[PDB]
Ligand binder design. Structure first.
Ligand SMILES: [Ca+2]
Ligand SMILES: [Ca+2]
Ligand SMILES: [Ca+2]
Ligand SMILES: [Ca+2]
Lengths: 95, 11, 95, 11
């Protein structure tokens, strides 16, 4: 598998591992998003000290407003972070 | 790697 | 780094490696998309035998229609593929 | 892995 193939597969596995803690593995609930954010994204999470931030991220990512994140909504989180990071890498090297 | 540091700085 | 962190970083590296063949490393041109598709995504590409398919994918992904893919447009390709793959994994296991 | 096979089947 290529690196792109491997990363597509990891995305799927990470979602599934975090979405399968309760009885619905197709949705990440608020509790599961809390755990994902404090363990896969600990570094970004620990910085922020206001606990209302995750509640605000959740609402913002929950596009159909059912209170849970489905795979696609979770991908918009991954993508939003990779875009900010890529913007900083450009900013830092074409300065 | 670079991402983890970025995440720390951004937000 | 977590698997999510590593995958965000690989996304950025893959884009940058494929976008940096010509003099613009912030955009993947048509030629570079051709190479990326025949090497990172060879398995999906080789199946299709109609060469007009990539031209049609390119047009579809090129949302601001400047003829090149920027990082975000490239992420919509990665995401569209991970979503179809996750849909097939659900279809196959909740059958 | 599973993705590479999927990609082969889908499209
Ligand atoms: Ca769940
Ligand atoms: Ca939702
Ligand atoms: Ca380029
Ligand atoms: Ca474009």
């Amino acid at each position: 598998p290529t690196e792109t193939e491997r990363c597509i597969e990891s995305l799927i596995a990470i979602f599934q591992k975090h979405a399968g803690r309760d009885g619905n593995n197709t949705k990440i609930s608020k509790t599961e998003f809390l755990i994902f954010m404090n363990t896969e994204l600990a570094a970004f999470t620990q910085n922020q000290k206001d606990p209302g931030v995750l509640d605000r991220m959740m609402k913002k990512l929950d596009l159909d407003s059912d209170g849970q994140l489905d795979f696609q909504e979770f991908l918009n989180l991954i993508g939003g972070l990779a875009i900010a990071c890529h913007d900083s890498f450009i900013k830092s090297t074409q300065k | 790697a670079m991402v983890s540091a970025f995440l720390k700085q951004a937000w």
